[PDB]
Design an enzyme around this catalytic site. Structure first.
Site, PDB file in Angstrom:
ATOM      1  CE1 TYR A 122      -2.992  -3.362   1.225  1.00 45.27           C
ATOM      2  CE2 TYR A 122      -4.200  -1.611  -0.003  1.00 45.27           C
ATOM      3  CZ  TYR A 122      -4.182  -2.810   0.720  1.00 45.27           C
ATOM      4  OH  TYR A 122      -5.281  -3.920   0.305  1.00 45.27           O
ATOM      5  N   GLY A 158       2.876   3.675  -1.607  1.00 50.31           N
ATOM      6  CA  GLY A 158       3.311   4.097  -2.906  1.00 50.31           C
ATOM      7  C   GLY A 158       2.201   3.761  -4.021  1.00 50.31           C
ATOM      8  N   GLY A 209       1.019   1.415  -5.261  1.00 55.49           N
ATOM      9  CA  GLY A 209       0.181   0.215  -5.090  1.00 55.49           C
ATOM     10  C   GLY A 209      -1.023   0.655  -4.157  1.00 55.49           C
ATOM     11  CG  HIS A 212      -2.144   7.973   3.554  1.00 54.79           C
ATOM     12  ND1 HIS A 212      -1.667   7.827   2.027  1.00 54.79           N
ATOM     13  CD2 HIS A 212      -2.278   9.204   3.915  1.00 54.79           C
ATOM     14  CE1 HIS A 212      -1.547   9.173   1.653  1.00 54.79           C
ATOM     15  NE2 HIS A 212      -1.779   9.939   2.552  1.00 54.79           N
ATOM     16  CG  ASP A 213      -2.988   3.676  -0.304  1.00 57.33           C
ATOM     17  OD1 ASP A 213      -2.217   4.465  -0.188  1.00 57.33           O
ATOM     18  OD2 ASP A 213      -2.356   2.583  -0.230  1.00 57.33           O
ATOM     19  CE1 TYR A 228      -4.045  11.615   0.625  1.00 57.58           C
ATOM     20  CE2 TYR A 228      -3.172  10.551  -1.358  1.00 57.58           C
ATOM     21  CZ  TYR A 228      -3.188  11.462  -0.147  1.00 57.58           C
ATOM     22  OH  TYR A 228      -2.027  12.184   0.095  1.00 57.58           O
ATOM     23  CE1 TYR A 249      -1.074  19.406   3.720  1.00 57.95           C
ATOM     24  CE2 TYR A 249      -2.161  17.709   2.192  1.00 57.95           C
ATOM     25  CZ  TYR A 249      -1.151  18.148   2.915  1.00 57.95           C
ATOM     26  OH  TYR A 249      -0.139  17.130   3.255  1.00 57.95           O
ATOM     27  CG  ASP A 261      -1.265  13.670   3.101  1.00 58.04           C
ATOM     28  OD1 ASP A 261      -1.570  12.810   2.715  1.00 58.04           O
ATOM     29  OD2 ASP A 261      -1.075  14.853   2.334  1.00 58.04           O
TER      30      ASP A 261
HETATM   31  C1  LIG Z   1       5.538  10.394  -0.446  1.00 59.12           C
HETATM   32  O1  LIG Z   1       5.397   9.061  -0.250  1.00 59.12           O
HETATM   33  C2  LIG Z   1       4.248   8.449  -0.286  1.00 59.12           C
HETATM   34  C3  LIG Z   1       3.481   7.431   0.230  1.00 59.12           C
HETATM   35  C4  LIG Z   1       2.579   6.799  -0.097  1.00 59.12           C
HETATM   36  C5  LIG Z   1       1.730   7.219  -1.469  1.00 59.12           C
HETATM   37  C6  LIG Z   1       0.536   6.582  -1.675  1.00 59.12           C
HETATM   38  O2  LIG Z   1       0.341   5.439  -1.354  1.00 59.12           O
HETATM   39  O3  LIG Z   1      -0.200   7.031  -2.460  1.00 59.12           O
HETATM   40  C7  LIG Z   1       2.293   8.368  -2.240  1.00 59.12           C
HETATM   41  C8  LIG Z   1       3.658   8.839  -1.926  1.00 59.12           C
HETATM   42 CA   LIG Z   2      -0.931   3.233  -2.399  1.00 62.39          CA
END
Ligand SMILES: COc1ccc(C(=O)O)cc1
Ligand SMILES: [Ca+2]
Length: 119
Positions: A27, A29, A31, A47-48, A51, A67, A93
């Site tokens: 999750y 990044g 992913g 967090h995903d 969003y 923001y 965040d």
């Molecule tokens: C800045 O690091 C990240 C961490 C997670 C995500 C994500 O999961 O969307 C994007 C950037």
């Molecule tokens: Ca992600």
């Protein structure tokens, strides 16, 4: 926006390069599917999902919405001037950056094979 999230991370986990969190588990990044591999990946799963919920707000684009926030003296604050989209995204965040600070980082779980391990 992503740049602000990175800065939250740089401020709450100053010991690591922020890019350590940009490709972790299922999750953290690009992913977003599968069983989270550990507690840090669970932070990223929440967090995903946060969003995806904020996306339901009209015109709300979590990677791009700028923001208003502050990081000073060990504390992150989402400011009052934020509209509903900005306040949600900033909250996603802030809570993730805090979660990151509290979670173990397992080198093994960096840059895993999403296709194979995150169905
Ligand atoms: C800045 O690091 C990240 C961490 C997670 C995500 C994500 O999961 O969307 C994007 C950037
Ligand atoms: Ca992600």
């Amino acid at each position: 926006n992503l740049y602000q999230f990175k800065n939250m991370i740089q401020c709450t986990v100053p010991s690591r390069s922020w890019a350590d969190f940009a490709d972790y588990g299922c999750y953290c990044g690009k992913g977003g599917s599968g069983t989270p591999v550990d507690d840090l990946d669970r932070c990223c799963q929440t967090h995903d999902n946060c969003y995806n919920e904020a996306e339901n707000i009209s015109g709300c684009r979590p990677y791009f919405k700028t923001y208003s926030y502050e990081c000073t003296q060990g504390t992150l604050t989402c400011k009052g001037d934020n509209n509903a989209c900005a306040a949600s995204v900033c909250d996603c965040d802030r809570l993730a950056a805090i979660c990151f600070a509290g979670a173990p980082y397992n080198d093994a779980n960096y840059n895993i094979d999403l296709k194979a391990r995150c169905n």
